[PDB]
Structures are given as C-alpha cells and as structure tokens.
Design a protein around this ligand. Structure first.
Ligand SMILES: Nc1ncnc2c1ncn2[C@@H]1O[C@H](COP(=O)(O)OP(=O)(O)OC[C@H]2O[C@H](O)[C@H](O)[C@@H]2O)[C@@H](O)[C@H]1O
Ligand SMILES: Nc1ncnc2c1ncn2[C@@H]1O[C@H](COP(=O)(O)OP(=O)(O)OC[C@H]2O[C@H](O)[C@H](O)[C@@H]2O)[C@@H](O)[C@H]1O
Ligand SMILES: NC(=O)c1cccnc1
Ligand code: NA
Ligand SMILES: [Zn+2]
Ligand SMILES: [Zn+2]
Lengths: 301, 301
C-alpha cells in the first residue's frame, strides 16, 4: 500500500497535489456544489427539493424522478420541470475551481450528477465532463422500439404551454434526457469510467450525499492508493452498514477509523473549501479573479 | 480472472464440483427457496408479500419492516407477525440439498436472508448458518441504552394476546431480532463474511432477487475465479446499470456478455434445479430418500 498523503488534512492533500505524483484529478460532484448559486439540493432537510414536493401528493418524493411512476403520472414532473431549465444561475467558486484544474492540466474528468449545466457555463468542455445523470438539452420518446429524438425547443414549447409532450411517431410520453430512477445512464459514463479510474491520482468529491447508485460506486473504482478528498457540509460515504444501505459493503470512505489512510473530509461550504484549498496551492487570487471576470462576462451577454 | 468451469452450464458446474479443487461451497439463499413449502416471497408480482399489504395502509410496502416507521406505528408489523412465526411449513428439496452439502463435507456456510428457520429444520446447525436478516428465536428491547432480551415465548404471549410488546425495564418497544430496514445486521454476518470468502471455491445462489444490501454485496466478496451458480426463476444480479440499482457497479453477475467466464444461471424452480444438480453428481436417490424420511419424521411429530 502506497501511502500518498503525508497526513489526512486539506494541507496534506494540497502538498500531494503540488507533487509530481499528482497528475490526474477526477472530480465527483453533486447538487451541493450549486446551492450557493441559488439551486436547492435534493436531500438537505427542509430546504432540499425532496422536502418541498407536498403539493404534488406523491407517494414518496423520489416518485417525481422515477420512470415507472412517470409513465403512470407524468403531470407532476412536467409541472416541476418549468423550474428545472438552466440560465437564471451563475456558476460558483467551486465550479471555477474545477475550471482552474482544467487550465492547469490536472483535470482528467469531472463526473457530475447535476443537470443545471453550470460546469459547461463555467467553461469545462464536453470532453472534460461526464454528465452522469443526463441532460435537459435533448429529449427522447420513452418507447424502446421508437426512441425518436426531440430538441430543446420542442420540449420547452411543450413544458411552458403545459401540453404533456407525446411522441409524434408512437404517441408515447416524451421526456428530457435527465436520468430517472430505473433508467440507464448515458453510455459515455461507463466508457469513460472504465479508462479514467485506472489512472486517477486524486478524487475530489464535492457536494454529494453519495446516496444513489451507480454514481456512489465510483469512489470504489479508484485504485486503493488514490487519496480521496471530500468537500461537503456533512460526512458522506462513511457509514456503518445496515439493511438498505446504498453503498456496497466496504465500498465507502474511511475518514475516521484506525485504518484510515487516504480519505479526508473537509466539512463546510464547497465554495469555502475550494477557496481554502486554492489558498494552500497558491491559486487563490487567480481563482477570485476568474470568478470576478467570468461573472462580469455573463452579465454582459 | 482465471476460468475454472469448462463450460458455463449446470453440467460444467457439476464437473467442477467433482474436481479436487471444489472443497468449500457457500450458499446464498432467499425467500425463493421457501415458496414451494407454502411461504410467499417478498417481491414476486401478485403473490409476494409486498404486493399484499394494502389493508395496513402503508406509505410503501417496505415500511412494515422499516425501523423508524415501526417505532411510530408498530401495530401493522405485529398484526402481520402472526403469519410470520416459523413452524407450520416443512423444508423443501432445496433445503435438503444443502443438508447433503453439509453431510458430504462441502458446505462451508449457508448465508440466508430468510427468517423461516427451514434451514435449521432441514438439519443445518448454528455453525453452518449465517441468519443474515436475523431470527424470531430471540427478541430485544429497541432502546440502545437498555437492550433487554426476551425469549420466544414472551414475544409470542405478547404477539398472540395482541398487546404491543413493551420492555419491562424501560418501556421501549420490544422487537423480534429480525433485521428491519435501517438496522444493523448481526455481528456474526460480518465476522463470518471476513473469513468465509477468502477461500470459497463455489457460490450457490438460490431463490433471491439480490435486491437488498449488504447481502447483495456478498457475491462480489468471493475471489474472482470462484464460479457462481444461480438457481432461480429469473436472472438476478445481472443488469445494465441504471439509476437506483442495488448492486454496486460491476459488483453483479455476468451470465451473458462475451466476457462471461464463471457465472451460470439455471432458471426454474429451486427444487428442480437442485434435483437436476443432484442427478449429475449421482446424489439424486440419496436426496429423494432424505426428503421423504424427513417429511415423514415431521409428519410424525
Ligand atoms: N453549499 C454546500 N457546500 C457543501 N456541501 C453542501 C452544500 N449544499 C449542500 N451540501 C451537501 O451536498 C449534498 C447534496 O446531496 P443530495 O442533495 O443528495 O444531492 P446529490 O447530487 O448527492 O444527489 C444525487 C442524485 O439524487 C437525486 O435523485 C438526483 O438523481 C441527483 O442527481 C448533501 O450532502 C448536502 O449536505
Ligand atoms: N420456487 C422458486 N424457485 C426458484 N426461484 C423462485 C421461487 N420462488 C420465488 N423465486 C424467485 O426468488 C426470488 C425472491 O426474491 P425476493 O422475494 O426479493 O426475496 P429475497 O429473499 O431476495 O428478499 C431479500 C430481503 O428483502 C426483504 O425486504 C427481506 O428483508 C428479505 O430478506 C425472486 O427472484 C423470485 O423470482
Ligand atoms: N443542481 C441540479 O442539477 C439540480 C437539479 C434539480 C434539482 N436540484 C438540483
Ligand atoms: Na453543477
Ligand atoms: Zn415514439
Ligand atoms: Zn428496555
């Protein structure tokens, strides 16, 4: 076992990142990286989306993003979907920190569970990204025998006119290519995962509860020696086993046991943790300038 | 990734089982092995328990075995629990096939998700068994500061008098030691798993949909060369990944891809699968005689 972190702290991760041994970083992110932009997450008590769906009278909150429920009752999704489209929000410091990794030749990939497109808006390119839970950008008829594609405009025209979008070929429901419970993830997820996780030197895990598979499996795909830094409000991925746990057995993070050797939890807001890390790396001013600049460009156009 | 089976069929598995190399077999079983005895499973459409709880007016079927739901509403579980006490049923051909494994010195362990006790009734002893999802035999006070134990008869008195079991010391609920969603599994599950899977030569997986963690992780604990035979009505543990899948990524079975090298799916009744296997091993007659005698002995008592 190569012990790559000289200590299990942000400072130790930063020293590692500056070494020659840290060539390729994979970011794994979720909704907590966009809450500072004004987008609520899913599972935060009271504020998260799943605590705010009472008006839809769902059997349980996740039903609104579940394919089998959606086929029986598509209306609640499509009413909610008016709010989901991007462009009223700017990327956060955390998004720009990932941009900085790209520009420093350190970003192997950002795997995102989010559909707000803020990674792209912050300037990560298509090849840098795996939008693991899909995209609002395109839509598809739900029938396996048809799968006719529809573009954003056709879906928007339907979403904002409150017309439940039906496919013109087979009259089956049509939906944005956001991944619902029960649906296949994009092929790109699996093909990038296969090669990426053979060669990652650091995993940065930000703003995710790690409560859904297969995304939560990604942390167990890195080599055993690859350090893993979590920047998040709460410890995630570290949990005693129990019946119904999400993670596979032994598949989680070990921050606190007597055997912990490579996992670090920095607890706080993602923006603050990225500033803190950037400071340690000597990038803080560069990062603040990038944010200031890019926020200004956005306000222009 | 070493290939031990000469072909990916029940015949190949039988031959491997006859080789010198097959010394230690672990069985991983669920409720499908007890349906032919008259005990419904959980997840089969129409017949399974989860499709038959309407009268309890549950938010979702699993709530009846969910620890936080239980504490708030214990009445539905205790009403259902009359049907649940083990006794009226006899072990199946499958259970006796495992008895034969024990008596031929091949059975390293049977890991069961069932609480029906049929494995013990068929003659498996405590040491051969990991009752992964607990047992009715003992009951405990739910309060973690107290943990008073109550014997079966005390729980039955309470069950059948239709008073909700209360701890005599601290007045918290008392619960049979079956594992609910959100509860930890028995300590034995983990201690046995740590050592059992180091040198197992064959996994036999029978009568389970592999839809619950951490039990579902067990198949991935075996070394990569250990073959795995599924005897089940349907394929389980093989899927394209999808959002909300139970298995961690690549932690499942691969019966059908072109990389398939060690997993075999025999689809049908567990009883029939075990008879077909017994036949190919030359144990068919011994199995049938054991079943008849044992059924005869139970009828007698
Ligand atoms: N500003 C912040 N800084 C740091 N951590 C934060 C912040 N805001 C929230 N958190 C933490 O951020 C985490 C947010 O966790 P979840 O809300 O489950 O979002 P996901 O992206 O993991 O959800 C994954 C999928 O589940 C859905 O079904 C969709 O399919 C999603 O794609 C929590 O630990 C918060 O404490
Ligand atoms: N006679 C049969 N022969 C062969 N296969 C069968 C038969 N009967 C049913 N099957 C298959 O047997 C499987 C039954 O699968 P599930 O009903 O999910 O039972 P589990 O033991 O895996 O449930 C695990 C836990 O979930 C609960 O919450 C409790 O915690 C349980 O302990 C299916 O694939 C059937 O097609
Ligand atoms: N940031 C996001 O992708 C998102 C989408 C829907 C709900 N909450 C968060
Ligand atoms: Na984002
Ligand atoms: Zn169609
Ligand atoms: Zn007590």
């Amino acid at each position: 076992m190569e012990r790559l972190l000289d200590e299990l702290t942000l400072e130790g991760v930063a020293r590692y990142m500056q070494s020659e041994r840290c060539r390729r970083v994979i970011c794994l992110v979720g909704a907590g990286i966009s809450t500072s932009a004004g987008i609520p997450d899913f599972r935060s008590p009271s504020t998260g989306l799943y605590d705010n769906l009472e008006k839809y009278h769902l059997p349980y909150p996740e039903a609104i993003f579940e394919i089998s429920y959606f086929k029986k009752h598509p209306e609640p999704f499509f009413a909610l979907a008016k709010e989901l489209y991007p462009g009223q929000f700017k990327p956060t410091i955390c998004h720009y920190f990932m941009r900085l990794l790209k520009d420093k030749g350190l970003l192997l990939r950002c795997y995102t569970q989010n559909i707000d497109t803020l990674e792209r808006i912050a300037g990560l390119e298509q090849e840098d990204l795996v939008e693991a839970h899909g995209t609002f950008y395109t839509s598809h008829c739900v029938s396996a025998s048809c799968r006719h594609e529809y573009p954003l405009s056709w879906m928007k025209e339907k979403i904002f006119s409150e017309v439940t979008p039906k496919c013109e070929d087979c009259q089956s429901l049509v939906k944005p290519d956001i991944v619902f419970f029960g649906e296949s993830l994009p092929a790109r997820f699996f093909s990038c995962m296969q090669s990426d996780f053979l060669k990652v030197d650091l995993l940065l895990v930000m703003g995710t509860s790690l409560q859904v598979q297969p995304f939560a499996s990604l942390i167990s795909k890195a080599p055993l020696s690859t350090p893993r830094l979590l920047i998040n409000k709460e410890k995630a991925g570290q949990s005693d086993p129990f019946l119904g746990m999400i993670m596979g057995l032994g598949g989680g993070m070990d921050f606190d046991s007597k055997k912990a050797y490579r996992d670090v939890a920095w607890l706080g807001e993602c923006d603050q943790g990225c500033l803190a890390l950037a400071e340690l790396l000597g990038w803080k001013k560069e990062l603040e300038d990038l944010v200031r600049r890019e926020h200004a460009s956005i306000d222009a156009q």
